[PDB]
Design a protein around this ligand. Structure first.
Ligand SMILES: Nc1nc2c(ncn2[C@@H]2O[C@H](COP(=O)(O)OP(=O)(O)OP(=O)(O)O)[C@@H](O)[C@H]2O)c(=O)[nH]1
Ligand SMILES: Nc1nc2c(ncn2[C@@H]2O[C@H](COP(=O)(O)OP(=O)(O)OP(=O)(O)O)[C@@H](O)[C@H]2O)c(=O)[nH]1
Ligand SMILES: Nc1nc2c(ncn2[C@@H]2O[C@H](COP(=O)(O)OP(=O)(O)O)[C@@H](O)[C@H]2O)c(=O)[nH]1
Ligand SMILES: Nc1nc2c(ncn2[C@@H]2O[C@H](COP(=O)(O)OP(=O)(O)O)[C@@H](O)[C@H]2O)c(=O)[nH]1
Ligand SMILES: [Mg+2]
Ligand SMILES: [Mg+2]
Ligand SMILES: [Zn+2]
Ligand SMILES: [Zn+2]
Ligand SMILES: [Zn+2]
Lengths: 430, 442, 52, 77, 442, 430
């Protein structure tokens, strides 16, 4: 049960490099690509992410896309960069210009056929194909436009499979780009129709994680991308190791998504704790559960206390008892009962996997479907209406060729998504 | 006196590992299928035959199939310690799971795997000369166990006809829960279990967890403990077929004594001398003490209280050093009790069995060694309370169509929810009506 | 298709690799729960005979 | 059906034995002329052993009996 | 007693290598045909005589001819390991192939080569004293096998007359395919074969691939595996001539028992203990188990399902340690089955044979060692489905005269396509008519 | 079963030198002609391409013809040039002038009798003669005119054998000479009548192979001629080595051509991959099949996706299972069913040969008959129509003696070939 990965734009390629470092480390693959591991358990599921090249070597089933090869040369130059297949790097000759319309319509249509050919070549080689995994930012240019283009083409070609995205979204306090509302709104419009499951991360939340919890003096993007690669590699762990209660991406989707538009989730990872404090408290299931539900440990700016949980999922790694999992999830649901949607009798799914990440006795990753996601969309829609009413930067997009009707459709669809979340927030049994 | 075991999905295969571990160790077959001879002169004995068949070279092989849609657990069995015991064709695995969808198992995915399973079950039944039932282990909470278990029981019921089918079923616990969609799968599992099974015994993990915390001294139990307890129960029930005894009990006698009307076939199970090694040497364990134990609610393996209902029939299995006169004295003392009540149309409420083989002790096990044990299966109207809580949780979710689009997309009509819910409602009314005294005389 | 001593060394290495799995960090619960314990359990055959 | 309970038909699984006389009829060119045509195996775009392949290659998988309670359904059989 | 083998084209020569390997090793003739330097006779007994003749000095030479139009395969035989076994005249090779054209084989080139073949076969037949038939191995999909096989069978049928001719024929698989023009050659072959063959056994590579995947454990099979299976089948059918047994069966008895009407001579073949070494020690292999096996479609060497038709006659050959009472009990149990149907005009449906010699084990082989085996050839109306699909593909191509200019250029009238197509249509109607119940026609 | 080769013009003689290098290497023949091989499998079919002269030596069955001796000096300077028989070199004293009429009518009829005498001398020495093999360009002067003249004469003398041509045709993008369309049109008229099977190669496709797949920094005509020599030496491999399912040029022709004018074929050779990438992929039958059907690996500018396959053939070299070959051809036929002409029930022939080319574990050559080949001829006809409407350069040809009606006749024949392909493309069952 093998996944094909796509990494798009600068953020996507940077996060991807750390992800493939983490995955190669857990399975004992040398930065030359040679297997150097020490148990058969590592080999027996290597197929999920790697293809086997001759006399030992493994190659990672990933597509790298960018509009200028500068990033591609940076990723090729990294410490694990050699592992990637040279033919898997796809690039153009001119940039997205930080413009969604360029990325979707002009350079997108120029490159997309070579990407679809590579993705189909990789997919049809699999004996049974599981979902695709895509990493990109919505605020950028080539990431948003060409990522959503490719998602639409893959959804046409493989409508029965799963489509999964991890996505970076603009912080509420400081912008990295002036035209963020247009790119975000158009990308969310594309995703809510096309995607099966979407996870959202705020860089501001990772900064607050580092400063408050880890007390790091001088954080760098390597730390933020390491936290993300840790959670990303944690979600798939039950796919690729034994356990008492196996789980799968489709089983997560079936338990998390009540209705098909409500597929945007919050993420967290629990055993975060500073090197000075770590000597003072041993790992146990109550400690992981308490950190896991603390909003301090959640990777979005919206806080659960302003909303209610429709559903949640917890994936546990390690040698552990079923009593602590079942009784902890019952106890947390009972003590905080006002924060759980009352017309579902049990909101949490659990899963347990034997093999923890190296150097931790235990870990859990948390996925949450919470109505407080409506506040992010409302904020983006307000900033979009302020910019659109004044035609603030529209001539760039119209000059590329977009009809103005796209902006009003995307705004209306996002506004209806906000309304639907608000309606499910205030529902009652009657 | 042969029986064939069918194990479905994750719970059923994991419980199967503990069961076959126990049956091997109890008969004495080594993990490689050979029985080491002890005496040089004499007959070989033949007791395994209920569960094993021997080749002409004397290897033993077991009468079981393992069914799963995901490979990982069965591939673990294939790579584990018992690799050589099972025939490799018997361990059947698909490509991808039923994703907690009963509809996916029943309509989309189980239809591909089901024909191999039917060919293996046929090949087993052709290699028999006395067959007295199928034993099925599954959970109704998950997708493949519900959907493929129902589809396979339907096919078995057409192909094999009159042959008996006895189910051990893990039902959704009344407040411990593991997945959101459990009510839909359990409701849909109902008709399959109502018209395609002869007796169905229901288990809830929360009760076996309570039993392992209270009686044994285990702070942090895991599924291997529960599965070893279930294996012990099955070994106690099938011991009447396999070893000498004073009063044998054939599997058809259970159906004759326990089932008053053809739908009223759901039974409660409990086991008496669950005790730790440190306590076991401080106490005698006479017949009357363990008989008193099986009626206490702290002993049951299903989370229901029978004091809120009325008993219709009880079947008591004693194994070990017991004398029939003591069993009769115990049953008469139970009958004297005021907190034990039988429906007035069932005056002769008890069936007894007495077998000489004491329960086996497993090297890694947590139960003490004891000279005698008793096991109970009983039919009681209190069971109606479990369905009422399942129906309330279904009604809460179904009032807003909380997940229905998954089920409709995988091939099922929306009408099937209302039909199944009405059938289980009629089953609730049956249990209300059967327990009503005949105060009206015309 | 005969085997040279190098092939014998490779086969022995593969057998050792299979035996030495499920070490301290890689122990599952099937590995630590279900083992070979036939030599430690007592076997009783007093109440079982041959059918005629 | 009977009172207060549903039959196997209502759910959509009649359990009668097949009509063996029709089953033992070879499928020749005259048969396909009378009904349908083209004794060739239908081509599929899915992997072998996948549910789409069995859906558009075999008759047993693609079969669907009517669903509904006998009281509401006309039945006509 | 004696039988002469004729091997034609590529499949027939390659299957011949496996056949003569097996017959040498089973009788005990060395691969070069010589004897140790101290013995006066290589073997004590004459049983080899059915397939080999010895010179007065005691060298052995086999009763076979190898016919091909291209040199390469026969040159491989000339340079291989069995160089000294064959007489060099027996290995006949032309200059250039029949290029997948039936017309090229039949009219232009085989017409030139055929008189040498007939002279060699005559030279064999003159050195015989109780010849009782010809065995022919060929594929009908290729040009020289179809065209020269038909032409040679026609000439043989005129010259030898009443002597029986039994064919083993590789037909085009129903969805695996190797060349575009297969339907034309197969139709024209079947047209010639209808008049001039007494029994024809049909094989499809897709079935033997399925059999080697499910029963044997071979991930990457090749033609040598299939050819060894075919050789085993031929050895099983001809074993009745060569070794002691309870119920012998002469080659003339097959045609008398299997063919009801002179056109209805195409038979299905299957073999029971096709099994791997790892499975063989997990299972007993009694008579009734292999008898139940031969009727399952997973055992067949032709891709047809007999449940879609009616049997007219079955011939069951048992070899090895079998007792007649078990064969009779097994056949009566088979007769009981409901998915096995006989035409009402054929009440006595079975012929039996029982031979004491168990199957031989070949040093490089992939089959396990087993004490007994059974082989069946049977006539059934299900065969009509294979022809209907070949005829439909012919009709599709012929509607546009897609390739006909090659056939017309190599010497054939266009009329021959249409004639053959009406004859195969009439054969389809024959299979419809023969299958009509007598109780229905009153 | 002996093949006679003819090399005409500069392109033909240069490709021939590389072809005879590859064949001499495979049979272990020293450039002096001495046998130095190490297995009997090399010797037992050496007769197919070499004749044996006395005391060891072997001589290659080839005729070299050209109008200026410049080429003879080029072949003589190559590493294997000495092997060729001196009497087999035929040359004039003045060039073709890039003119078809000059090459066909004035110096052609002057030299052609000596070429026919040499070809007959070579043919009558064989114990059984298989088809002829001819290499030439269609855009040149002596290549087109004298090649088609000689082809017509050999077709008169040996009508029951096979006539095979490999032919280079002018790129739509790059040309070395202005008058390419006239010479091409007249040559295509000659080929469609005379030939049994014709393969077409665009130099543009070889440049795109070199630049994209092999990433050569400074490709030369030697590389293009190496790719061509590889396929040419591959097609005959089953004639001259053992295998599990033998095949022959005549069986290829019988399976590929439904009707006698439809004898134009596509070419491919599968194991092509850059020296950097080679560490990344182990050899297997799926990989060869995947490269074999990729239009990137096809040696013409037309792409199969614009047409439909009537028939195709694959010849495999190496030790491999027949099951994998048959099941691969079934899977490709089933998944892409819209690209195969529906009134033929099975379009692919397979063949398997035991002996791979030196230094490769496995190889396949692919031959395809696809209607999109009509697009090349249409482009040539367009350029012809642009020049012909204005009588742009006709006085050279008319001064040689051609009637203008000849140009319109040749144009009409090419237009009818295009029409016949288009009609069979759009045919239906009804
Ligand atoms: N007693 C016991 N219960 C188990 C065991 N494994 C799972 N369960 C319970 O059974 C239910 C889950 O059913 P599963 O067996 O995992 O479902 P499944 O058959 O795998 O179905 P899919 O998820 O679609 O593959 C939950 O209530 C679990 O608590 C076990 O080993 N022992
Ligand atoms: N079972 C089996 N089938 C074979 C074997 N060899 C070839 N075939 C099949 O037979 C058909 C090809 O027939 P060939 O024997 O190659 O034809 P031919 O007799 O050589 O005729 P020409 O090609 O004209 O020389 C294809 O369907 C092959 O799959 C073999 O050794 N065993
Ligand atoms: N977490 C994380 N965010 C990044 C990284 N690189 C860029 N970003 C963020 O992504 C956004 C810029 O998008 P970018 O990747 O440049 O879009 P592109 O131009 O289309 O490739 C900004 O919000 C950056 O803060 C990284 O390595 N890690
Ligand atoms: N691929 C390839 N093309 C060639 C070679 N030599 C010449 N050409 C091309 O063929 C055309 C010239 O034709 P030429 O062979 O000189 O015609 P000729 O004078 O009649 O022999 C130009 O397009 C050249 O680029 C060669 O060795 N290989
Ligand atoms: Mg599961
Ligand atoms: Mg041949
Ligand atoms: Zn039913
Ligand atoms: Zn058809
Ligand atoms: Zn009803």
């Amino acid at each position: 049960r093998e996944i094909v990965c796509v990494q798009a734009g600068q953020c996507g390629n940077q996060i991807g490099s750390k992800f493939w470092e983490v995955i190669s480390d857990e399975h004992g693959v040398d930065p030359t690509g040679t297997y150097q591991g020490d148990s058969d358990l590592q080999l027996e599921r290597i197929n999920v992410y790697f293809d086997e090249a001759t006399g030992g070597r493994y190659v990672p089933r990933s597509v790298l896309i960018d509009l200028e090869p500068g990033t591609m040369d940076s990723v090729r130059a990294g410490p694990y960069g050699q592992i990637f297949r040279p033919d898997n790097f796809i690039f153009g000759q001119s940039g997205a210009g930080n413009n969604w319309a360029k990325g979707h319509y002009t350079e997108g249509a120029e490159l997309i056929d070579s990407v679809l050919d590579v993705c189909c070549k990789e997919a049809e080689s699999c004996d049974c194909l599981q979902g695709f995994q895509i990493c990109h930012s919505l605020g950028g240019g080539t990431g948003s436009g060409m990522g959503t283009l490719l998602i639409s083409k893959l959804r046409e070609q493989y409508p029965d499979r799963i489509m999964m995205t991890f996505s970076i979204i603009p912080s509420p306090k400081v912008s990295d780009t002036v035209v963020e509302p247009y790119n975000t709104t158009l990308s969310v419009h594309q995703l809510v129709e096309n995607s099966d499951e979407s996870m959202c991360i705020d860089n501001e939340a990772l900064y607050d994680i580092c400063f408050r919890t880890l007390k790091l003096t001088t954080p760098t993007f390597g730390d933020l991308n390491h936290l993300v690669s840790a959670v990303v590699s944690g979600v798939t762990c039950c796919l690729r190791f034994p356990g008492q209660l196996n789980s799968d991406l489709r089983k997560l989707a079936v338990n998390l998504v009540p209705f098909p538009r409500l597929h945007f989730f919050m993420m967290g990872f629990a055993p975060l704790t500073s090197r000075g404090s770590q000597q003072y408290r041993g790992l146990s299931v109550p400690e992981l559960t308490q950190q896991m539900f603390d909003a301090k440990n959640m990777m979005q700016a919206a806080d659960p206390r302003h909303g209610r949980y429709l559903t949640a999922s917890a994936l546990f790694r390690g040698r552990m008892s079923t009593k602590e999992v079942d009784e902890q999830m019952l106890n947390v649901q009972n003590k905080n009962s006002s924060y759980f949607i009352e017309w579902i009798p049990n909101n949490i799914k659990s899963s347990v996997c034997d093999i923890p990440p190296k150097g931790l006795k235990m870990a859990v990753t948390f996925i949450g479907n919470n109505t407080c996601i409506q506040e992010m969309f409302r904020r983006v829609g307000e900033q979009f209406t302020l910019m659109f009413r004044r035609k603030a930067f529209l001539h760039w997009y119209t000059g590329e060729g977009m009809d103005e009707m796209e902006f009003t459709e995307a705004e209306s669809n996002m506004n209806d998504l906000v309304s639907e979340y608000q309606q499910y927030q205030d529902a009652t049994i009657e | 006196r042969e029986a064939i075991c069918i194990h479905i999905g994750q719970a059923g295969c994991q419980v199967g590992n503990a069961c076959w571990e126990l049956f091997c160790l109890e008969h004495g077959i080594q993990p490689d299928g050979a029985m080491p001879s002890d005496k040089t002169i004499g007959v070989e004995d033949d007791a395994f035959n209920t569960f094993f068949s021997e080749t002409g070279a004397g290897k033993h092989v077991p009468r079981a199939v393992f069914l799963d849609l995901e490979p990982t657990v069965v591939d673990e069995v294939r790579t584990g310690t018992y690799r050589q015991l099972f025939h490799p064709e018997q361990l059947i695995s698909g490509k991808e799971d039923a994703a907690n969808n009963y509809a996916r198992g029943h309509y989309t995915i189980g239809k591909e795997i089901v024909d191999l399973c039917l060919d293996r079950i046929r090949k087993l039944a052709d290699n028999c000369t006395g067959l007295q039932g199928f034993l099925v282990y599954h959970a109704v909470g998950g997708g493949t166990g519900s959907g493929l278990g129902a589809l396979l029981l339907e096919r078995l019921s057409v192909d094999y006809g009159k042959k008996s089918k006895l189910g051990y079923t893990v039902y959704p616990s009344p407040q411990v829960s593991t997945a959101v969609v459990e009510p839909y799968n359990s409701v849909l599992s109902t008709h399959s279990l109502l018209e395609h099974t002869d007796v169905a015994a229901m288990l809830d993990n929360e009760a076996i967890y309570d039993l392992t915390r209270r009686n044994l001294d285990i702070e942090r139990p895991t599924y291997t403990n529960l599965n070893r307890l279930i294996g012990q129960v099955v070994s106690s029930l099938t011991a009447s077929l396999r070893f000498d005894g004073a009063l044998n009990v054939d599997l058809t006698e259970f159906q004759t004594n326990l089932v008053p009307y053809p739908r009223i076939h759901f039974v409660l199970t409990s086991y008496a001398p669950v005790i730790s090694a440190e306590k076991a040497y401080h106490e005698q364990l006479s017949v009357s003490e363990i008989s008193n134990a099986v009626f206490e609610p702290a002993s049951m393996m299903t989370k229901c209280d029978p004091r809120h209902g009325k008993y219709m029939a009880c079947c008591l299995m004693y194994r070990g050093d017991v004398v029939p006169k003591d069993v009769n004295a115990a049953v008469a003392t139970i009958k004297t009790k005021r907190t034990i009540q039988f429906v007035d149309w069932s005056p002769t409420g008890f069936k007894c069995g007495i077998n000489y083989q004491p329960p086996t002790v497993v090297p890694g096990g947590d139960l003490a060694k004891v000279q005698r044990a008793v096991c109970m299966i009983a039919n009681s109207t209190a069971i109606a309370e479990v369905f009422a809580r399942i129906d309330h949780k279904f009604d809460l979710m179904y009032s807003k169509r909380a997940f229905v689009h998954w089920y409709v997309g995988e091939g099922m009509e929306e009408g099937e929810f209302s039909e199944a819910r009405e059938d289980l409602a009629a089953l609730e009314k049956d249990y209300e009506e059967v327990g009503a005294e005949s105060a009206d005389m015309d | 298709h005969t085997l040279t001593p190098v092939h014998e060394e490779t086969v022995l290495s593969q057998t050792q690799r299979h035996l030495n799995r499920h070490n301290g960090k890689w122990a599952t619960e099937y590995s630590v729960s279900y083992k070979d314990s036939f030599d430690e359990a007592e076997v009783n055959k007093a109440y079982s005979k041959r059918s005629i | 059906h009977d009172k207060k309970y549903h039959h196997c038909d209502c759910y959509g699984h009649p359990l009668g034995l097949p009509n063996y006389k029709v089953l033992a009829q070879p499928r020749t060119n005259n048969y396909y002329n009378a009904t349908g045509g083209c004794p060739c195996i239908p081509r599929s775009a899915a992997h072998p052993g996948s549910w789409r392949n069995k859906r558009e290659q075999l008759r047993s998988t693609a079969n669907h009996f009517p669903f509904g309670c006998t009281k509401k359904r006309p039945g006509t059989t």
